Amino acid sequence: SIWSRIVNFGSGWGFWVSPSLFITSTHVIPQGTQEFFGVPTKQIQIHKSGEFCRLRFPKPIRTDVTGMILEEGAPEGTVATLLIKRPTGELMPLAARMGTHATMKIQGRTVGGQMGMLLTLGTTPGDCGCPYIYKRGNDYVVIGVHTAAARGGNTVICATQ
Ligand SMILES: *[C@@H](CC(=O)OCC)[C@H](C[C@@H]1CCNC1=O)NC(=O)[C@@H](CC(=O)[C@@H](NC(=O)c1cc(C)on1)C(C)C)Cc1ccc(F)cc1
């Protein structure tokens, strides 16, 4: 049911935080489109924090979902889950131990986020946009969306804010 919140968006993915709140990666948003989920973009309030992109819709799109907690990353050392959906449909939950929160230089662009290390295949280019989630007590907490990963190593970057 939490997987039903990850949706094909552009060249990547997006996650329904609330009935009205879609989050995704800036690199993934289609730039030639004038409506998202049937709502015209003129009526959609889009806020960008580097690679973390937040789309607030005028009217709730997903009646069925409950709102989730959104926070700027997780505490250093938290083992989050990277809910990767694949274009084939397969679901790849990945464990990532999150680390330093920082503003990073990724390919000349400035990016706020949190680095993480995948624990024990890996991530690929279709995967930008998928959410990082960890359970805190009884509530799930979404902390960011996948934006990058080191060519050499396990490092994954989770765009935040
Ligand atoms: C997802 C988006 C995509 O395909 O867009 C094309 C622009 C893709 C996912 C990664 C590719 C391989 N595995 C992935 O998880 N993201 C990107 O291609 C971003 C670039 C990278 O991932 C590079 N990584 C780094 O530069 C890097 C830096 C650090 C600390 O760790 N890795 C490649 C080595 C893959 C696109 C991007 C995002 C944000 C930016 F500011 C610039 C560029």
Residue numbers in the entry: 4 to 123, 132 to 172
What does the paper say about this structure?
The protease plays a crucial role in viral replication by cleaving the polyprotein into individual nonstructural proteins. HuNoV proteases are cysteine proteases structurally similar to picornavirus 3C-like proteases with a chymotrypsin-like fold. Their active site features a catalytic triad with histidine-30 (H30) as the catalytic base, cysteine-139 (C139) as the catalytic nucleophile, and glutamic acid-54 (E54) as an acidic residue which orients and stabilizes the conformation of H30 (15). The substrate binding pockets S1 to S4 in the HuNoV protease, which accommodates the P1 to P4 residues of the substrate, are in the cavity between the BII-CII loop (beta strands BII and CII, residue 102–117) and the DII, EII, and FII beta strands of the second beta-barrel.
To ascertain that similar conformational changes in the BII-CII loop occur in other GII-Pros in response to rupintrivir binding, we first determined the crystal structures of apo GII.4-Pro Sydney (2012 GII.4 variant) and GII.3-Pro to 2.4 Å and 2.6 Å, respectively, followed by their crystal structures in complex with rupintrivir to 2.5 Å and 2.71 Å resolution. These structures show that the BII-CII extends from the closed conformation to the same open position observed in GI.1-Pro. The R112 sidechain orients away from the active site, adopting a conformation similar to that observed in GI.1-Pro to accommodate the P2 sidechain of rupintrivir. Unlike the GII.4-Pro HOV-rupintrivir structure, the BII-CII loop is not involved in any crystal contact in these two structures. As a result, the BII-CII loop does not adopt the hyperextended conformation. While remaining the same in the GII.4-Pro Sydney and GII.3-Pro structures, this sidechain adopts a different conformation in the GII.4-Pro HOV structure with a hyperextended BII-CII loop. In GII-Pros, but not GI.1-Pro, the BII-CII loop switches from a closed state to an open state to accommodate rupintrivir. While rupintrivir makes backbone hydrogen bond contacts with the inflexible portion of the binding pocket, that is, alanine-158 and alanine-160, the molecule relies mainly on van der Waals interactions to bind the BII-CII loop.
